[PDB]
Design a protein around this ligand. Structure first.
Ligand code: MKN
Lengths: 172, 172
């Protein structure tokens, strides 16, 4: 995946978030620290928060990331699309996990009710672990895919099943 | 707790895999043809066991004493879904699912290669997106989880231009 996509992946709360543009940051609602009143040196006052279940969008009044160009954010992707989940792990290692996306789903995973776009990992047969699959610290990592000449972001990592084979992307 | 990924090591014109502190496997064709040492050990002290595109090195001292010994097998049962553990010089880690087939001699871009055939499971096009193999990936290991045990069953020898078909070189 291109360097300009990896540059947008930002350590945040208990997981990650993604810069769509200089003013727009997206993340998984449950990774956001509950007491937080400041983000990138700005007060809540100065920020427009748009929350839909496990999807949260932050729109800043000023350019926090002026090095970046605005990208396309879509509301999930067609069934059958292959996405990469842009996961950073211990070492500056970069793990673009391949996932075949499916239908919008409602699930119970461990102790929680989760809603978003379901996918199946294409990394291995029994991806329950850090080497081939996701771990709880990956929450907020972006789902991206290439279309013709463009890259698109279409959601953020919200949950995985006990087996690790099924993941859920929260969508706008 | 050393990951599988720490066992994958840049070597020659591709990669290789540490099975144990003293055992290193790779694709025969990536090995330098001019050398007096590997990993700081003189060639006098290294046992080289070659079988077509599969080579095993057995060192007289512990090169990777941080590692436990893993199961090495001569390929796997037909239908096993293995993971090819690809490292790239970007720092990206690309585990790709491959459904394994029969041992054969296959014509791969006008060349005969003997090993275990496999088909990538990342679908349509495996190039333009991190979804398939490229020439510098040779030597990457084929692994799978069986009960509690990780199994390594060979090394990446060849892939078609098309994308779909790969060859895993195997021991004996
Ligand atoms: C039997 C007939 S085709 C086939 C598979 C296709 C895709 C699979 C898969 C599993 C994990 N990642 N991709 S399994 C098995």
């Amino acid at each position: 995946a291109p360097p300009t996509l990896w540059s947008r992946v930002t350590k945040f709360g208990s997981g990650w978030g993604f810069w769509v543009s200089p003013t727009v940051f997206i993340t998984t609602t449950h990774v956001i620290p509950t007491s937080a009143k400041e983000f990138f040196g700005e007060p809540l006052t100065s920020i427009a928060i748009h929350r839909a279940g496990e999807f949260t969008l932050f729109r800043f009044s000023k350019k926090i990331r002026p090095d970046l160009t605005g990208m396309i954010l879509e509301e999930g992707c067609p069934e059958g699309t292959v996405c990469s989940v842009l996961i950073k792990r211990d070492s500056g290692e970069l793990l673009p996990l391949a996932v075949r996306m499916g239908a919008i789903a409602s699930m119970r995973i461990q102790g929680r009710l989760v809603h978003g776009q379901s996918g199946m990992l294409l990394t291995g047969a029994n991806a329950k672990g850090m080497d081939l699959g996701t771990i709880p610290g990956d929450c907020g990592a972006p789902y991206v895919y290439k279309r013709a000449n463009d890259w698109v972001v279409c959601g953020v990592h919200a949950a995985a099943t006990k087996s690790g084979n099924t993941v859920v992307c929260a969508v706008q």
